[PDB]
Design a protein around this ligand. Structure first.
Ligand code: ATP
Ligand code: ATP
Lengths: 286, 285
C-alpha cells in the first residue's frame, strides 16, 4: 500500500543500422531498425509497476511523432503517466549501430526533461502521503532535483536517489536522501555519506549493501550479456519493490531478487520487450 | 516539355550536435526542426515552383509522416504519383548539424525500396521524346540504370545527380546527358563524356563544363543559416532556367541557380527554406 512517485524522464530510443558513422559533409543510407520506450525514469517506474507496486511516472512528452508513440506504448504498462497531454519538443536517443565498426555511437536529446517545471510536477504528488516514495534519477538540474527532494521531505516521503547521469554538484544532496543507489564510478565521485541505506552496484561483479555500519555483498547472477540496456534500472526497481512488498528497508534478499531480475534483462534485447514480465517478477520475488 | 522525377520524399529531422560522435561515445544533441524533404521531392518541388510541368514519382508510407507529406505536397504545383501510399514507414532523414563543419545525413529507403520498377514506369507512360528524366542517388545501381535505359528507349533527356553517392554509379555516365555533382562526387565518380557537366563547390561557386569549355560561376554571398537543400535548389533552378529559355544549361542558368541557392542557405529547414514561386519568377526574369 505504500506508493512510488517517479519524477524523471521518458524517451524513444531509436536503433539505426548503418555501414559506418558518416563524416561531416557525407550523406549515407541507413536503416531505422527499431524503437523502444527508454529513459531511466520510465524504465524504473515501469518495472516497479510490473512488480505490483502502485507507481506514478511523472515525466514530460512532446508534441511530435515520438511523443504520440510514447503515450500510446505506455498504455500497455500497469503504470500511470502524468501529466496527460503533452508539451513540445521531445527526449530520445539515436543509437547508431555500425557494421565492421565496433561500438555504437549515441546521440541523446533532453529538451522535454530540461523544460519540465516544478509547477508541472508537484501537483501530481498532491495525493502523496507520509511513507510514500519519491524516486529520482539524474535527469534534472541540481536545483530542480534538490527542490523535489525537499518537497518530499516536507510531506514525510521517503527519498530514493540514483544520481545517473552524474552531476558533481549532486554530492551536496546526501542529507536529503534516505536510499542511495550508485555504481562504482558514482560511489567514488559523489562520495555518498550518512545515507542510511547505500547500495553500490558493480555490474557483473555484484553489488554492495551498506550502512547500519554493516557491509554486505551480493554476487550477480551469471548471465549471457546479450544486451545490458536497462540492467541498472531493473536492479534498482526490483530491489525497491522487494523491500516494499516485504515491508522492510532494503536488505540482502532485496539485492538477491534484484540481481536475479537484472540477469533476465541482460539476457534479452531492448527495453520493455526485454525486462522481466509481471509473472516472471512475481515468481522470483517469491 | 515535361520533367519526370523518380526519387524519394522524406521528413527531415535536424539535430544540432557539437561534432559527429566517435564510435562508442554518447553525446548530447538538440532537435532543431522537422520538415518535408528528400532529394527527389526537393528538386521536383523547386522545378514546379519555377513553372516547369513536373511529375514526382516517389513513395510515401502509411504513417503520420506520410499523411503530412501528402498534405504538404498538395499545396505545390507538382503532381505526386502514385496517389496511394505503401504499407511502410515513410522515408526519413537525420541531418546531423555540428557547430563547425558541414552536415552529415542518414536517410532510410524502406518506402522507396517497396516502390518497384514495374510499378514506377507506368507513371511515365505519357512521356514523349524530349521530356526529361531526373534522378538522384536514392536507388541502387540496377534500379537507377534501368530507369535511365527506359528513358533513353523513349527518347528522353537524362539528368543525373549522384547523391547520395554510390561507388558503382561511375558506370552510368554513358547514359547521362546532364550531370550535376559537387566536388567530392566529381572526383569520386569521375564523370566523363557527358554533354553538360556541372561541378558545384559550395560558397566557392560552381563550374559549367561543356564541349571542352569551362566557365566558373561565383556563388552569391549569403549568410549560411542552414545549407540543407542548397544543391537541390541549384540543380532545379539551373535546369528550370535553361528549360524556360529553351537552351542547354549556360552561364545565365548557373547565375540564376546561384541566386536561388543563396536564398535557401539563408533560410532554415528544407521545404520551408526554398524560394517561393514568386521569388523564383522575379529571380528568373
Ligand atoms: N553481465 C551481467 N550479468 C549478470 N548481472 C548483471 C550484468 N550486468 C549488470 N548486472 C546486474 O545489474 C546490476 C546493475 O548494474 P551496473 O552497476 O552495471 O548498473 P548501472 O551502471 O547503473 O547501469 P547503466 O549502464 O544503465 O548505467 C548489477 O549489480 C548486476 O546485479
Ligand atoms: N555558403 C554559401 N553561400 C552562398 N551560396 C552557397 C553556399 N553554399 C552553397 N551555395 C550555393 O549552392 C550551390 C549548391 O552547392 P554545394 O556544392 O554545397 O552543394 P551540395 O554539396 O550538393 O549540397 P547538398 O547536397 O547538401 O544540398 C553552390 O554552388 C552555391 O551556388
Amino acid at each position: 500500500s505504500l506508493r512510488v512517485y517517479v519524477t524523471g524522464n521518458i524517451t524513444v530510443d531509436e536503433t539505426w543500422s548503418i555501414p559506418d558513422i558518416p563524416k561531416k559533409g557525407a550523406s549515407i543510407h541507413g536503416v531505422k531498425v527499431s524503437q523502444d520506450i527508454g529513459g531511466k525514469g520510465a524504465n524504473q517506474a515501469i518495472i516497479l509497476s510490473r512488480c505490483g507496486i502502485e507507481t506514478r511516472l511523472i515525466a514530460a512528452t512532446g508534441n511530435d511523432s515520438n511523443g504520440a508513440w510514447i503515450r500510446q506504448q505506455i498504455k500497455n504498462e500497469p503504470l500511470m503517466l502524468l501529466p496527460d497531454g503533452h508539451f513540445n519538443q521531445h527526449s530520445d536517443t539515436s543509437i547508431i549501430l555500425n557494421s565492421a565498426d565496433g561500438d555504437n555511437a549515441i546521440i541523446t536529446t533532453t529538451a522535454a526533461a530540461d523544460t519540465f517545471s516544478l509547477d508541472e510536477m508537484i501537483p501530481h504528488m498532491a495525493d502523496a502521503v507520509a511513507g510514500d516514495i519519491l524516486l529520482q534519477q539524474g535527469n534534472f538540474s541540481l536545483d530542480k532535483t534538490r527542490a523535489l527532494f525537499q518537497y518530499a521531505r516536507s510531506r514525510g516521503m521517503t527519498t530514493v536517489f540514483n544520481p545517473s547521469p552524474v552531476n558533481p554538484d549532486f554530492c551536496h544532496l546526501w542529507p536529503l536522501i534516505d536510499i542511495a543507489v550508485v555504481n562504482e564510478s558514482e560511489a567514488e565521485l559523489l562520495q555518498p555519506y550518512g545515507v542510511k541505506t547505500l547500495v553500490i552496484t558493480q555490474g557483473a561483479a555484484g553489488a554492495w549493501l551498506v550502512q547500519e555500519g554493516q557491509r554486505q555483498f551480493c554476487p550477480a547472477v551469471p548471465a549471457e550479456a546479450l544486451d545490458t540496456t536497462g540492467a541498472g534500472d531493473t536492479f534498482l526497481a526490483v530491489m525497491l519493490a522487494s523491500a516494499l512488498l516485504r515491508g522492510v528497508a532494503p536488505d540482502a534478499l532485496a539485492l538477491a531478487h534484484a540481481s536475479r531480475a537484472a540477469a533476465i534483462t541482460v539476457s534479452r534485447r531492448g527495453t520493455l520487450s526485454a525486462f522481466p514480465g509481471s509473472r516472471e517478477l512475481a515468481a522470483l520475488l517469491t
